[PDB]
Amino acid sequence: SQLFADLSREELTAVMRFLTQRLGPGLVDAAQARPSDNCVFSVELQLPPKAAALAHLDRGSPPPAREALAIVFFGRQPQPNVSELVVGPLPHPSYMRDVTVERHGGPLPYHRRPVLFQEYLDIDQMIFNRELPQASGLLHHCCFYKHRGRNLVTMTTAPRGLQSGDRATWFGLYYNISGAGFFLHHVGLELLVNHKALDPARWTIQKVFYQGRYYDSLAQLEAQFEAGLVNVVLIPDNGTGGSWSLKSPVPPGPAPPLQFYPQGPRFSVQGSRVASSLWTFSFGLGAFSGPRIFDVRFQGERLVYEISLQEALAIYGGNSPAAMTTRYVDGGFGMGKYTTPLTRGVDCPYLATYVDWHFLLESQAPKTIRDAFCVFEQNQGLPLRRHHSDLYSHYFGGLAETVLVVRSMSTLLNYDYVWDTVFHPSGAIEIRFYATGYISSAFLFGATGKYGNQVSEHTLGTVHTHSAHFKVDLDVAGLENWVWAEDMVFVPMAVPWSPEHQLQRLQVTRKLLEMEEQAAFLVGSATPRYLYLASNHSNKWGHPRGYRIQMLSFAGEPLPQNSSMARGFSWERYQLAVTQRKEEEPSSSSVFNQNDPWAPTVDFSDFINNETIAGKDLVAWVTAGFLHIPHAEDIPNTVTVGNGVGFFLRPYNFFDEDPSFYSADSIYFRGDQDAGACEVNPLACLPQAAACAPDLPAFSHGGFS
Amino acid sequence: THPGQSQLFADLSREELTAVMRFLTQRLGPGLVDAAQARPSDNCVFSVELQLPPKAAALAHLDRGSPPPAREALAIVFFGRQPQPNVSELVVGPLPHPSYMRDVTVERHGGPLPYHRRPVLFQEYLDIDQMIFNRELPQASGLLHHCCFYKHRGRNLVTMTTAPRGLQSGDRATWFGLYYNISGAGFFLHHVGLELLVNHKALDPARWTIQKVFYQGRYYDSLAQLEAQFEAGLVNVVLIPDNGTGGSWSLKSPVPPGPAPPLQFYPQGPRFSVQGSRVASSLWTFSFGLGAFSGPRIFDVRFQGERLVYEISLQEALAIYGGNSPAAMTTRYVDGGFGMGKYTTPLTRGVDCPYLATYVDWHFLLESQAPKTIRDAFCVFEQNQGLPLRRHHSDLYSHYFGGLAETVLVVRSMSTLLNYDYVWDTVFHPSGAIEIRFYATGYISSAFLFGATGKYGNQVSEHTLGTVHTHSAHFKVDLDVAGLENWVWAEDMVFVPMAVPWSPEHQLQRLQVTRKLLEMEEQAAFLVGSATPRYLYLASNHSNKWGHPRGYRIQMLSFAGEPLPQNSSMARGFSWERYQLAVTQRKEEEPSSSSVFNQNDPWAPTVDFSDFINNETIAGKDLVAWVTAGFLHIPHAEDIPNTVTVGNGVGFFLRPYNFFDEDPSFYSADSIYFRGDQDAGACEVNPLACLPQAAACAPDLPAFSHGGFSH
């Protein structure tokens, strides 16, 4: 049903006409809001509760009410707070409900709120107009400063301070490169900026970093320079070769392979539901959590209630302060908020289905981010399977793997994150994520090689880790799942038919995990080889109907626990976790963990807490990531190759046999058949389409802000 | 003067093979026999294939235009007609018109080759199958009429063989499963419960014995003693079906073709070329072969002119089994001693490679006296991957898109051994990276289901234990990173707890990078499930444009199982299993990890890869990395009929680490870019806007045409 569908523009609009009329005037378009104002920061779908939904999907029951969730910024008042407000019911809403206290247990400190655009906007005037011209001396000799500075530019960092309550953000300055990436031109200057106040006027600059040293203020600095105790070096504002560009010099060649659907496309997309002769599901994007799918049904049978992105994380080293503070909790800005338009042919097959996404964020109207998702089938040029017999009997049987794919890409500053869920006709599911886009760069002063690699002119490639977190609500043959751990061992035995001789007996080992903690594995420890969620049920051969989680992760090694900050993303700590699903444990991180991870608005280690995971509705949680030491070949961009991570969800005695066997595209023939004949196999039936083939739609592109 | 053009890594042609055969026939002093009919007592040309050039000479030719080296071939010859019958390895050249033949056996090995090390001939298997079906199985006719539909001769029944044949060096006794022959699908599942330990050391098959029998869960001392028991009542007997329907039985999908899978086509020109053993793209050039036993290999790999790696080449495949029954419980298959090339098979167009791949034949003289030809053995194609190599969308300050969809160059062969269908891959990325892949599909070696099961796998069909096994494969990677002389580096990370420099009250966990130089062979020998440097890479003395050594990172992609424990005498035969990764001084006497002759005497192996790792520097030398890659397999229902690929994609990457000064892809023709201020719908701004207006037009397809079956 149109049940897990993100909110229509119409829906978004009408929640707003409510919120506005029913929060009094004195409410502001968050576009232009100052901290001490009341504004609505986000209106997005409030996902239904699970029980109420299944009821409606499986057993007639009418459908749970369709409800928004507005995050409201309550600045204008003596005790300013943030408030999560459920609104509804949709399409024509009548009620509203502060749920804040329910969830966290008290109000939301106002300093956990995400920085607004207008806030950045103000912060830049405080620098571009009031702090930088103090050093218009130095900046002219270092970096082409002209009065009053539209050649330079800023980039936020990580958490914003050192202990809770702080709202002080280190910014770098970079040249405002035209039509290409600025992230590689760290002008050498970093600035701590305390913007904790509700009055921007009282914002200060607690610190300043230049070519290796720290000065309490900007005058403090420009002075120390003008005294000739500081060696300026002129940084070139211009260049050639990828450092400075993306447009390739080399001109177009013969076009690259195109895939097309000879007989027309073999899947559909209505609303946000996807349907192919193997899979149905519903897809979507959470403004902050990012992309998610639900009600994944493989040939009518539900495999998972939910797979979704929880969080994404990035944790730096560095020369500089702004780098060596920096840990972004990117959901803190928002994977959905920052899903960019997909470029037809580049991001996705020219012939994918490209779907729009709507949102109301920091505004009062909804806007659309066109071509936000793509769905497509993709021949892999690979057997799903195959056998060829020359022994005893002559036959061949195999099948080319085509795969179904849904994808969106989130561009958050330097990074373009690639989010893939892919659907194998073996009944398997792959989640992949890819880090591409630009890197974050420092400016380079000598004391370096512990903090990364010179990738350029003046440019340090600043070491970091990536990590990402997924919710996997497997309902293996319905809710009650257990969790098993199969692996392996050798055992010195006698050889039965020569007990004088020894053999090394290979054995499987199985073990049921009964307790939330026995199924929480840290990065650094050993996962077992075979690990799955079972049902009480068995398949025909008497084997716990099961789905296996096989992880593709290169231990993006974790910020140690001893840090004050770590509870902001305690999931980085874990390779894998399973818990009892619970409406009150609905997410792994939250938009609010960004600006105060010392007071986690949600701390994941909580979820794990001496409970049974024996015949309960379980949910597994997977972390995926790698170490990234940037190197020259990351210029201009980091590439996808090798940097795919995630996991496989694989059938494991779930079925009675490989369901591909019932496949429509299986190919089979014997030594004694005419393999060249169209009704021995259909490959030998070239005709297929009429005219000159793949009919192609005229190119367009989403656009920008 | 001369870059040197010769293709000296191309495997032998038919002519060439014939030539060598002719040469040998004559110089062997009759008594010589065709392999496909040889008795143990005979003399026999087992293999003849390419001999690879020594490396000095090759590069001399290829780099400094020197004259190329003698093209030679290796002959394996079983001398069974004598008092100390030996196997011998013979070099024969120089092709095309040979005129010399030298015995290299003793030089390579330190003495002659114990005769029993030799693989088992198609004859030997035939002779065995007679001893079985014609002098033994009748002694139990009764049983088999009852359980197993038997008559004169058995004919509905079929054998299959296990790995190490015996329990010491010197043993040649194989445990032989027996199974229902099946029309047009896998006999492997339909194991009847009988298993025979044939002793076939003797060169006189008359003297061959059966030393033990196993029916359905008990050991009898001989098929005669089993009739004794059978008819005297004392043997409870399980009746296992001849026939059936579905997965355990068929392979034919019972379903009509749907509409059509998606089809990949190069909408103008292809974009690479194959010319003999040599492939060439805009970015990449390399030669590709097939060892008979070692299997697929490529050589002389060149990214934009520059050679990255001299050789990459599967060295060996393993399969270690657990079980209830004597077959499965001691089966440690060492698949090269059958041969990954030998058992290569034809790629079925439209399935095993895209339809419009370029396919290619593969000639061989094996257990024969005239060369023969696997048709379509290799395929080469440009797979678009559906997925950017890189992109960046900019909404912030500056409005631009720049990106490029990864398209990729693949080279595939599949060895089919018994049940196994190994897909071998080598994949070339526009980034300048090289991905090795490996799959296992096909059917699964199974046992008759009986008793302790769960300790040895899952039941997977009626009477059918999908037994537990591990996989391993070994690879040779002779990088030669901008030069022969390389070192190996090991970078990783660490967190240092420090006080925040600008607020000394507080701490931070300070992220740092750790570069450590690996200087001795043993410091770069990493064992299974272990300490493994996140960034491990081989590099040059020479540095890039920003001062960092020029390097290639080896990124492993394995899930390996517990190796065979080292306390087994048999362990030595695949010592490479116990390593994820090694790096050694590359040598002419260290050419292969394994040996076709290891398989039948791992107790005294022909090669023991652990020998390559001796107190030796790897500080600036010719360096060859050795990646072991694989995993554990507990079969299950969805392995029926075939184990599927999805998720068993094992192997590794070769990834460029400060080898360049920028990403090569910056220069790709297929790159795309536009500014906000432009129309991206206009053909001159965007190559892709021009695809509808023009390119479209799919080609007419070649008529399908499979390359059929052997004998």
Ligand SMILES: *[C@@H]1O[C@H](CO)[C@@H](O[C@@H]2O[C@H](CO)[C@@H](O[C@@H]3O[C@H](CO[C@@H]4O[C@H](CO)[C@@H](O)[C@H](O)[C@@H]4O)[C@@H](O)[C@H](O[C@H]4O[C@H](CO)[C@@H](O)[C@H](O)[C@@H]4O)[C@@H]3O)[C@H](O)[C@H]2NC(C)=O)[C@H](O)[C@H]1NC(C)=O
């Ligand atoms: C976080 O911050 C938010 C916003 O500041 C809080 O939201 C309000 O909190 C206060 C209590 O702390 C409550 O405000 C109530 O406002 C209502 C205003 O009237 C409504 O609109 C119309 C009339 O214009 C009516 O038709 C509706 O029935 C509404 O009532 C009002 O109902 C209520 O009552 C009265 O109480 C006092 C004392 O007598 C008077 O000041 C007032 O004039 C009136 O007589 C409150 O004033 C309510 O909880 C929230 N209001 C809204 C709109 O959300 C959160 O409570 C804060 N969170 C935390 C944890 O503190």
Ligand SMILES: *[C@@H]1O[C@H](CO)[C@@H](O[C@@H]2O[C@H](CO)[C@@H](O[C@@H]3O[C@H](CO)[C@@H](O)[C@H](O)[C@@H]3O)[C@H](O)[C@H]2NC(C)=O)[C@H](O)[C@H]1NC(C)=O
């Ligand atoms: C393995 O087997 C081969 C063949 O059985 C052995 O090689 C053979 O060695 C004999 C002598 O050892 C050679 O014959 C002799 O030639 C000389 C002069 O030409 C002559 O004086 C002798 O009377 C006899 O004719 C024979 O040619 C040679 N054959 C081949 C094909 O090389 C070999 O020695 C065995 N290997 C080992 C390690 O023992």
Ligand SMILES: *[C@@H]1O[C@H](CO)[C@@H](O[C@@H]2O[C@H](CO)[C@@H](O)[C@H](O)[C@H]2NC(C)=O)[C@H](O)[C@H]1NC(C)=O
């Ligand atoms: C940063 O530089 C960019 C260009 O590199 C500026 O963007 C353009 O500037 C022109 C100036 O007339 C204006 O029309 C727009 O501002 C931009 N044009 C387009 C087509 O995008 C930008 O103003 C600079 N600085 C900041 C802080 O945004």
Ligand SMILES: *[C@@H]1O[C@H](CO)[C@@H](O[C@@H]2O[C@H](CO)[C@@H](O)[C@H](O)[C@H]2NC(C)=O)[C@H](O)[C@H]1NC(C)=O
């Ligand atoms: C096992 O069964 C297969 C049936 O596929 C037999 O193969 C056929 O045998 C006949 C008689 O020899 C041949 O003429 C056909 O050409 C064969 N057909 C195929 C498809 O191979 C096989 O001979 C039987 N028995 C054994 C021991 O292999």
Ligand SMILES: O=c1cc(NC2CCCCC2)c(-c2nnc[nH]2)nn1-c1ccccc1
């Ligand atoms: O989306 C923005 C927008 C920023 N500034 C512009 C300023 C002008 C109007 C649009 C908002 C800015 C910005 N402006 N100065 C520093 N940063 N940052 N980010 C951002 C987004 C995700 C993650 C990090 C930053």
Ligand SMILES: O=c1cc(NC2CCCCC2)c(-c2nnc[nH]2)nn1-c1ccccc1
């Ligand atoms: O290629 C064969 C061929 C076998 N038998 C042949 C079939 C063809 C005619 C002569 C006898 C046999 C065979 N015949 N009886 C038992 N085995 N085996 N294998 C084989 C190949 C690779 C790995 C393992 C076995």
Ligand SMILES: *[C@@H]1O[C@H](CO)[C@@H](O)[C@H](O)[C@H]1NC(C)=O
């Ligand atoms: C499997 O067992 C649980 C025991 O708690 C039971 O409640 C459940 O209903 C069983 N499954 C079915 C289909 O009855």
Ligand SMILES: *[C@@H]1O[C@H](CO)[C@@H](O)[C@H](O)[C@H]1NC(C)=O
């Ligand atoms: C966990 O809960 C059980 C009650 O079901 C209790 O017996 C056990 O002692 C508890 N463990 C801890 C560490 O609190």
Ligand SMILES: *[C@H]1O[C@H](CO)[C@@H](O)[C@H](O)[C@H]1NC(C)=O
């Ligand atoms: C964290 O690390 C070790 C653990 O004993 C210790 O040196 C240090 O005191 C710990 N931090 C504390 C107690 O705040």
Ligand SMILES: *[C@H]1O[C@H](CO)[C@@H](O)[C@H](O)[C@H]1NC(C)=O
């Ligand atoms: C590196 O190799 C050796 C050191 O053992 C030396 O002779 C050679 O000159 C060196 N080359 C460079 C570029 O450092």
Ligand SMILES: *[C@H]1O[C@H](CO)[C@@H](O)[C@H](O)[C@H]1NC(C)=O
């Ligand atoms: C390696 O040999 C031994 C240890 O195996 C040691 O004494 C020696 O110093 C090493 N030799 C050289 C030449 O590097």
Ligand SMILES: [Ca+2]
């Ligand atoms: Ca819990």
Ligand SMILES: [Ca+2]
């Ligand atoms: Ca569940």
Ligand SMILES: [Ca+2]
């Ligand atoms: Ca060595």
Ligand SMILES: [Ca+2]
């Ligand atoms: Ca080397």
Ligand SMILES: [Cu+2]
């Ligand atoms: Cu990165």
